[PDB]
Amino acid sequence: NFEGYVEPELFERPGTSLPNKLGVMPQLTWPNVLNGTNCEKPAVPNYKPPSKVDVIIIGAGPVGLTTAACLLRQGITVRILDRSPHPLPVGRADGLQPRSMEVFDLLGLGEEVYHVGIRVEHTTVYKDGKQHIFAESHQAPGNEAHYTGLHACTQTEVEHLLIRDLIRHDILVERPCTATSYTFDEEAASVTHPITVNITNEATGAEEVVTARFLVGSDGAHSMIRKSLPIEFPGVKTDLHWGIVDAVINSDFPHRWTFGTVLNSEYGGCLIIPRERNMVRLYVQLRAEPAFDHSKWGPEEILVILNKVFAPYTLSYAEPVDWYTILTINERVATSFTYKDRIFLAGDSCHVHSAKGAFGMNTGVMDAHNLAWKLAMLCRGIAKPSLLASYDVERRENALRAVATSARYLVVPPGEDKDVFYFKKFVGQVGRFLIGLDVDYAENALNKLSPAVSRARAGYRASNPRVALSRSHSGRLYHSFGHLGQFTLLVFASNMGGALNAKLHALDSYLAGPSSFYHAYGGADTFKIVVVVRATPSQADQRVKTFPFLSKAGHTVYDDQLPLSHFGGDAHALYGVSHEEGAIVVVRPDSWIGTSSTISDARSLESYFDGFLFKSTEG
Amino acid sequence: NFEGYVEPELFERPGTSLPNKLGVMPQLTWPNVLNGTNCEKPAVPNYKPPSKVDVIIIGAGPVGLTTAACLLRQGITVRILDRSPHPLPVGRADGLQPRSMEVFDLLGLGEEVYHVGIRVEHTTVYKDGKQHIFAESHQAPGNEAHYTGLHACTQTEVEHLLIRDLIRHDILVERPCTATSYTFDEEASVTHPITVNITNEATGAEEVVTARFLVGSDGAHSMIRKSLPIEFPGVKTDLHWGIVDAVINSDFPHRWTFGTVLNSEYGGCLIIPRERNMVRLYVQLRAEPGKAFDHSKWGPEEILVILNKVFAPYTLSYAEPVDWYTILTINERVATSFTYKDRIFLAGDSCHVHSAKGAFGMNTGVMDAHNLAWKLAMLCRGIAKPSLLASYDVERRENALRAVATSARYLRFVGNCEDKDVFYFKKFVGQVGRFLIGLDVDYAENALNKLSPAVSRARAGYRASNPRVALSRSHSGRLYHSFGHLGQFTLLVFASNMGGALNAKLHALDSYLAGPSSFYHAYGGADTFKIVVVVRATPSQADQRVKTFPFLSKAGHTVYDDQLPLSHFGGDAHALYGVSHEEGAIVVVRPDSWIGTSSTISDARSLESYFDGFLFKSTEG
Ligand SMILES: Cc1cc2nc3c(=O)[nH]c(=O)nc-3n(C[C@H](O)[C@H](O)[C@H](O)COP(=O)(O)OP(=O)(O)OC[C@H]3O[C@@H](n4cnc5c(N)ncnc54)[C@H](O)[C@@H]3O)c2cc1C
Numbered sequence A: 001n002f003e004g005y006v007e008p009e010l011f012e013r014p015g016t017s018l019p020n021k022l023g024v025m026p027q028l029t030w031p032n033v034l035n036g037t038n039c040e041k042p043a044v045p046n047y048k049p050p051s052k053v054d055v056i057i058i059g060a061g062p063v064g065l066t067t068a069a070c071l072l073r074q075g076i077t078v079r080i081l082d083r084s085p086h087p088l089p090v091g092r093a094d095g096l097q098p099r100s101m102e103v104f105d106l107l108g109l110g111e112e113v114y115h116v117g118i119r120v121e122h123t124t125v126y127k128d129g130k131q132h133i134f135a136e137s138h139q140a141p142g143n144e145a146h147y148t149g150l151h152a153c154t155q156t157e158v159e160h161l162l163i164r165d166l167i168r169h170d171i172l173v174e175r176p177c178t179a180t181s182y183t184f185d186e187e188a189a190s191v192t193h194p195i196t197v198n199i200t201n202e203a204t205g206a207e208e209v210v211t212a213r214f215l216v217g218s219d220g221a222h223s224m225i226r227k228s229l230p231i232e233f234p235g236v237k238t239d240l241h242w243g244i245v246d247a248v249i250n251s252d253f254p255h256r257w258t259f260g261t262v263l264n265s266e267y268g269g270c271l272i273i274p275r276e277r278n279m280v281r282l283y284v285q286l287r288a289e290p291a292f293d294h295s296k297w298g299p300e301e302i303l304v305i306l307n308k309v310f311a312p313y314t315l316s317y318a319e320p321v322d323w324y325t326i327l328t329i330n331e332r333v334a335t336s337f338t339y340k341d342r343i344f345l346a347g348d349s350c351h352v353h354s355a356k357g358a359f360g361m362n363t364g365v366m367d368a369h370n371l372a373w374k375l376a377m378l379c380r381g382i383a384k385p386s387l388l389a390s391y392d393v394e395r396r397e398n399a400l401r402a403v404a405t406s407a408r409y410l411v412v413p414p415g416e417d418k419d420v421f422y423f424k425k426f427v428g429q430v431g432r433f434l435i436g437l438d439v440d441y442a443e444n445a446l447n448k449l450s451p452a453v454s455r456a457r458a459g460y461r462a463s464n465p466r467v468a469l470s471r472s473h474s475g476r477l478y479h480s481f482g483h484l485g486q487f488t489l490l491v492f493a494s495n496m497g498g499a500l501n502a503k504l505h506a507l508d509s510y511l512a513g514p515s516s517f518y519h520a521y522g523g524a525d526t527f528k529i530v531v532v533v534r535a536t537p538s539q540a541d542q543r544v545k546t547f548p549f550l551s552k553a554g555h556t557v558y559d560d561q562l563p564l565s566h567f568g569g570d571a572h573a574l575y576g577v578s579h580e581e582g583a584i585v586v587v588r589p590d591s592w593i594g595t596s597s598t599i600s601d602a603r604s605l606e607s608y609f610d611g612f613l614f615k616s617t618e619g
Numbered sequence B: 001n002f003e004g005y006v007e008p009e010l011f012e013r014p015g016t017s018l019p020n021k022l023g024v025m026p027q028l029t030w031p032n033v034l035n036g037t038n039c040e041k042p043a044v045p046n047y048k049p050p051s052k053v054d055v056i057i058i059g060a061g062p063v064g065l066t067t068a069a070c071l072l073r074q075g076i077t078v079r080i081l082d083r084s085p086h087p088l089p090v091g092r093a094d095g096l097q098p099r100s101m102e103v104f105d106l107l108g109l110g111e112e113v114y115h116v117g118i119r120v121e122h123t124t125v126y127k128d129g130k131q132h133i134f135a136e137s138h139q140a141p142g143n144e145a146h147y148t149g150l151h152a153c154t155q156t157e158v159e160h161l162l163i164r165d166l167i168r169h170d171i172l173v174e175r176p177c178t179a180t181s182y183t184f185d186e187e188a189s190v191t192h193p194i195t196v197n198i199t200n201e202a203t204g205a206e207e208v209v210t211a212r213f214l215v216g217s218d219g220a221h222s223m224i225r226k227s228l229p230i231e232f233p234g235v236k237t238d239l240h241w242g243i244v245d246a247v248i249n250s251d252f253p254h255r256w257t258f259g260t261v262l263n264s265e266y267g268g269c270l271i272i273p274r275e276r277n278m279v280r281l282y283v284q285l286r287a288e289p290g291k292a293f294d295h296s297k298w299g300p301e302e303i304l305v306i307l308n309k310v311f312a313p314y315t316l317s318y319a320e321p322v323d324w325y326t327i328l329t330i331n332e333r334v335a336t337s338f339t340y341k342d343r344i345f346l347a348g349d350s351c352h353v354h355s356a357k358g359a360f361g362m363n364t365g366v367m368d369a370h371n372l373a374w375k376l377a378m379l380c381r382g383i384a385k386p387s388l389l390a391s392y393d394v395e396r397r398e399n400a401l402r403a404v405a406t407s408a409r410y411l412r413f414v415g416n417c418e419d420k421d422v423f424y425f426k427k428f429v430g431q432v433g434r435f436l437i438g439l440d441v442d443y444a445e446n447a448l449n450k451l452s453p454a455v456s457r458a459r460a461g462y463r464a465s466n467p468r469v470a471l472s473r474s475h476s477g478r479l480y481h482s483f484g485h486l487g488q489f490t491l492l493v494f495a496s497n498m499g500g501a502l503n504a505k506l507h508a509l510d511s512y513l514a515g516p517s518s519f520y521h522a523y524g525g526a527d528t529f530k531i532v533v534v535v536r537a538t539p540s541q542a543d544q545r546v547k548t549f550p551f552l553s554k555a556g557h558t559v560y561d562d563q564l565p566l567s568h569f570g571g572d573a574h575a576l577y578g579v580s581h582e583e584g585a586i587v588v589v590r591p592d593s594w595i596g597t598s599s600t601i602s603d604a605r606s607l608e609s610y611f612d613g614f615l616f617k618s619t620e621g
């Protein structure tokens, strides 16, 4: 006894971008599926969110939505709202770095961001009509990374998939609902919910107050929550300007379309970004003088200056403009990202960078990811103040790093071009940071450097080599990690023979005891044991069975890859583990290395966990 | 009470390919890990292979190894031999099509073939120094397919990853062992009517093995094919390709992008990008007038002079010693039959040989092996009627006959030679460019493929669509992820939102299937089928309704068809398979992921005679 299915109602939203001589593209959308509460038949039926919530989220852009989704995966009750009546129809951010892709894949959303748009794996450089560079680029090593290159997947499409994931968890974005004010009882231990937020529905007029444990401010560049705190938002209004267009553009450019840069020392530079559906996005330098004037800079105006930059190649529109705008470059970074461990900024509320870098969605999503697993452990009370302090530190300084490299985006060998040689050297110094594999967290309570392995480094990306999860399934070591509420204890065990056998038996006895760090901080509620055995699956299952605690609570994985070279790379060599001493690597929930230890030193982790965690016991 | 871990002995095997002025690269290997029984201590300790196995495999090239790997998933007992003392050090095939990627992914080996080498997603075409074409190519659409483009993954890497997968299953390739002779008692009923006579050519020890079935993956000069009254026709063009893998420097504006460089005077060149900054260049070499072709005349250095004539005015020069070099003579042949009395089966180059240029050999070979192995497994289980191994023969032979035809069309212009050369290539790409990436592997009707109008798009004998779906509230993946294992058909029960008209029909089907005489139970139950209920609703809405059908929730697996409506921002499984929300559908998906048939929810009885067309009745447990 259920109603039949009805196909969702298409609406072709018109385009708000300035047109060209062909028009502005409309944008396909489905308001009932995508507009949250602001619709006639909501994708979640009879959605009745509570008045008391663990986390309230102001802002339902890419960063708020990611935060919503990571929390919902940990069982944290959540409400989220956004002032706009519908998600972004087109434009703004347009692609993801390899490391952003890794994040979605760890959340179970890898298929939604992969193979949406095109893939960028090459770069070109031209100067004054003459090709200088065409090369493979944006690469990650296959024996350490699944994803490589940049991936076109726009902000619209990211909002779509994240809204659909919230729906799958029976959560809707409340639109179009503004958070007008909020209170924080800084003074009151007895209280659980010292936050109240007044919400006003700009469609219907109804007000509301929610009480919440924690508040996440992800409301963009002009954040009211940031403005309400003793936080400053310093930066430099460069007053340099980009004209940006997204469209299908016919050209005789030999490399249509390839990521890269077209330099004219005469007329300034152009940046090419290939797009889905035979489109290209073109950034172009914009300078005006006889004060910067927005009035005479339309889509057709910049195509005229574009043809001057690509001489002798010429560009002509083949269809109506998909997107278009002028951007002012202002880079800003909040002095702090936390406040009293109750109000938390993430995304454009914390930092604003030039669009050119493409950091906002990428750095934003990685902010939400860093925040959400720490904030979630705060909701079940095992998080010491240090843990959420590491959020502010780790992501603020990464925001500062993004600011330095965007500034310098802008001594030569004799037979060499001055502006192209500083490009190859730029690509060399920051290339891996531009793809996310070199996001670098300095030492803190969570990142404890250790010489126990020669290569895996605290505060740095965990390496993702190929391993066998079973006899039949040969995938990636990331696939064995725990969920967002657990730390992954990588226990490298060699082939569990030689010297290490005794040490592993010791290790087994330490861990089973109720005073072990595993048991001391919650057992399987906060840890996932992975035993990495460099042996055949039959030799390993045999041997793992002699270790009663390891067999009974560990998940064995088979490190059966060929030795490190251009034909292989096992986890032991790629993490830098000694076959005599073993290792216990602590991978944080977000995939970054936390610390490491030898099998003998497994007791050193009691101190390491005490730095940011309170003791806990499994359920 | 276990010995400590010893790191594998590395050996740099010298190259046997002719050098350039800088030499010939050695090739990294690890004899104790990769050479099977023929090493000092094997990677499977005390491999004691039985003298009586279900299936014995002759040849451990990509095809034989793939066949072993599929059978070992199924619990078939297997012995696999190869005359050669080690696997391929370098060269021959260098890449996989998107559809071969899907085949590895279904076997659980997708991560071993992805991100091994480079990826080809673009084509260029030059003629007489002027560029004519530079575009995205080899695309598959993302709302239907995970992989797209060409993936560089060599025969060497493929053999590596398949040998390692056999080690995980405690199987070693028996090297360097030759099947000298074999007997097949057609007289008698015995379980094991095949005996194979084996000589190790290292130690001279002979041995006899008894098998239920024999697989001839022994290559182009298959001894097994010759023993059988099976013909191997085709034409030997004595057209010649010069092939060279090397790091090559060039001022070519597109170095290196897949494509073709034409020169009117000097013929043509095919480009293939490779890992580690190499490139593969095919170039035509033509025999002088009257005289036969003289291999003696063409080394790496000579080939490079022809390449610089073909690429004028851009020049090429070696930066490193040659990684690989050979002269292939194109000779395309197909066996008149691929099976023999459903006891000896051919797969790979023993069945068909192609122009390397087309890169058919390894991709079709893996797909043959895939096709063969699941049918052969049901034959070992007993449930296979002869009609099914018949479908192996005609599916793969016909596909081989198709593959020959498209390169016969390609190779006429290239040997011969608004621009009419580039025009014929654009049309050629538009016509076969998706069979060339494998999505148009197209099986004609037979017992296994019955066309059915119950759905608008899914089609018997064609590739099952792979749209995005949610497998849980937090895991949004692909529909292939729900499919059964290699000895199961996937019963894709499209159920709409389980509401309206269909609620009644689906309640009937629930009680139909639960009976011991429904097609599900009659042909094996969970031993032959997996049910997937594809609900176009939200997860908790779907979970609730599914609870109201007791057999479907008891025995089916719910996936959530929650993408946006089919467009450029989405595509639900219901729309991409062509299901009507009034009728529903039971799309039957074969083990290899080709569509078998479909019916409406009310026509569930129609599948009964479908499965009797090629299966014996079975009972779970
Ligand atoms: C015009 C423009 C162009 C851009 N171009 C690029 C680009 O080319 N490349 C790139 O990488 N990045 C670009 N960005 C940045 C990118 O859009 C953001 O970095 C990314 O969306 C992350 O921002 P966010 O999710 O934190 O918030 P945003 O998406 O900026 O906005 C957060 C949301 O909060 C809501 N909100 C604000 N105040 C309230 C309130 N009081 N109550 C309720 N809801 C509220 C807003 O409605 C908004 O939807 C651009 C941004 C803008 C504005």
Ligand SMILES: Cc1cc2nc3c(=O)[nH]c(=O)nc-3n(C[C@H](O)[C@H](O)[C@H](O)COP(=O)(O)OP(=O)(O)OC[C@H]3O[C@@H](n4cnc5c(N)ncnc54)[C@H](O)[C@@H]3O)c2cc1C
Binding pocket: B058, B059, B060, B061, B062, B063, B064, B081, B082, B083, B084, B092, B093, B094, B155, B177, B178, B179, B180, B217, B218, B219, B220, B222, B223, B326, B328, B347, B348, B349, B350, B356, B357, B358, B359, B360, B361, B362, B363, B365
């Ligand atoms: C020179 C050359 C170049 C090629 N180039 C390309 C290319 O560019 N692209 C492409 O896609 N394909 C190419 N191929 C084809 C590719 O090598 C084959 O398609 C692929 O190996 C599949 O063949 P197969 O596994 O069936 O047999 P193969 O790998 O060719 O050989 C089968 C195996 O059987 C073994 N064997 C033979 N007889 C016996 C016996 N009596 N007892 C035991 N073992 C035996 C052999 O030693 C060998 O290991 C090339 C092949 C060759 C020979």
